[PDB]
Write an enzyme that holds these catalytic residues in place. Sequence first.
Site, PDB file in Angstrom:
ATOM      1  N   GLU A  52      -2.367  -6.013   1.119  1.00 33.29           N
ATOM      2  CA  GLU A  52      -3.329  -6.372   0.043  1.00 33.29           C
ATOM      3  C   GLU A  52      -4.226  -7.727  -0.007  1.00 33.29           C
ATOM      4  O   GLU A  52      -4.877  -8.265  -0.393  1.00 33.29           O
ATOM      5  CB  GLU A  52      -2.252  -6.937  -1.344  1.00 33.29           C
ATOM      6  CG  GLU A  52      -1.593  -5.681  -1.290  1.00 33.29           C
ATOM      7  CD  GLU A  52      -1.812  -4.637  -2.448  1.00 33.29           C
ATOM      8  OE1 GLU A  52      -3.007  -4.280  -2.229  1.00 33.29           O
ATOM      9  OE2 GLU A  52      -0.516  -4.717  -3.035  1.00 33.29           O
ATOM     10  N   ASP A  69       0.321  -1.344   0.548  1.00 32.72           N
ATOM     11  CA  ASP A  69       0.139  -0.048  -0.029  1.00 32.72           C
ATOM     12  C   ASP A  69       0.739   1.637   0.301  1.00 32.72           C
ATOM     13  O   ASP A  69       0.622   2.587   0.497  1.00 32.72           O
ATOM     14  CB  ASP A  69      -1.183  -0.048   1.207  1.00 32.72           C
ATOM     15  CG  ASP A  69      -1.968  -0.865   1.456  1.00 32.72           C
ATOM     16  OD1 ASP A  69      -2.269  -2.090  -0.260  1.00 32.72           O
ATOM     17  OD2 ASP A  69      -2.596  -1.411   2.112  1.00 32.72           O
TER      18      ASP A  69
HETATM   19 MN   LIG Z   1      -4.478  -2.262   1.425  1.00 35.91          MN
HETATM   20 MN   LIG Z   2      -0.479  -2.134  -4.216  1.00 36.07          MN
HETATM   21 MN   LIG Z   3      -3.236  -1.750  -1.639  1.00 32.74          MN
END
Ligand SMILES: [Mn+2]
Ligand SMILES: [Mn+2]
Ligand SMILES: [Mn+2]
Length: 177
Positions: free
Chosen positions: A113, A17
């Site tokens: 994720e 992220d």
């Molecule tokens: Mn995330």
């Molecule tokens: Mn990503």
């Molecule tokens: Mn993500």
Amino acid sequence: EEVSGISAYLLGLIIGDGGLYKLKYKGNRSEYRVVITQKSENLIKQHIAPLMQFLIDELNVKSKIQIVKGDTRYELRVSSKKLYYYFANMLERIRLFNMREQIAFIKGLYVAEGDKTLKRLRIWNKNKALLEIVSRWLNNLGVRNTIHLDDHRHGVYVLNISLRDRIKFVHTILSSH
DNA sequence: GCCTTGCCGGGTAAGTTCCGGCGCG
DNA sequence: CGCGCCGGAACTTACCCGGCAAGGC
Ligand SMILES: [Mn+2]
Ligand SMILES: [Mn+2]
Ligand SMILES: [Mn+2]
Ligand SMILES: [Mn+2]
């Protein structure tokens, strides 16, 4: 030892992220960014930041942890050529992670994720090679899984952890340090 | 009949790179 | 002169969520 575990975890969040950015400004200015974004204010200030701070302290990085509140999300940012290369070089040697680092990194990557409902155990990413690396690790840990193209709209692949091994997964990987 | 897992669409929670600062030798 | 740390935020979409169903037992 303890540094590298926390490192691989953070690297997970980052590749998931955030990212590692080498920028070229006008002119010829530059910047090196280590970044983690997230919606949860609490997750970023109470959990992630103390961990980044420890790593920063431990590597004598005079840089500071920036936390920028944008429209949709919180961006934790360290602007530092040193920390940048630190992670980038770790990323370059990802295929050599030991067991602690593997578990740390997958944990990090799942928080970013992964399927949080935990009713299904899934990980999304456009990077098939990354997912393949993670898949081989999970197999050597006795966690069966398959990879296949999930979203044809965007070429996003998914790594699906078999529900058969839910508990070996959730207690080995997610319930760690 | 039930469990696992591939399919596929909704849209928001992520990511990416502009800008203007300021400082360094 | 070239380069590295701050503080933003505009901009795009890659992740997540979750209902469905096709096999396997
Ligand atoms: Mn995330
Ligand atoms: Mn990503
Ligand atoms: Mn993500
Ligand atoms: Mn397909």
